[PDB]
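Here is a typical sample entry:
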Amino acid sequence: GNGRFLTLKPLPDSIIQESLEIQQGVNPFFIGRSEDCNCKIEDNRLSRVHCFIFKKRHAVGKSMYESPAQGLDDIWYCHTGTNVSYLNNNRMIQGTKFLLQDGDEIKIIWDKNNKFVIGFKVEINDTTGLFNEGLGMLQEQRVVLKQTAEEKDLVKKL
């Protein structure tokens, strides 16, 4: 783990076959058409801050012993593109936050007529104090969350 905590690899299933590497030091990782986005994807439909993956400290209870997930950090995928995105089987409109599990393929654009399909595979190599890495633990909860003024601020800087 030289620095790349998470690796987003736009796989062949995606119009673009490149590899993106999020660094533990980079939070949140911005994605879109304009390289400004830490992540780089050239999709005419994509936007400047098409979407970004943000990292937050996992909210847990009180550990009265020696156990993990005692306040570590989780990685949330935050879609900011008007073209909406799809992760596994969840919808994510511009202004949503989603939990990212190791080996998560996120599709940011799918066109039936234009045959435009995108999708990157999240591969976590380094765990920068992650409660797990992003795949959670026990009863997986894959639900789309709503973005707030806080997340909106992150994109303000990009």
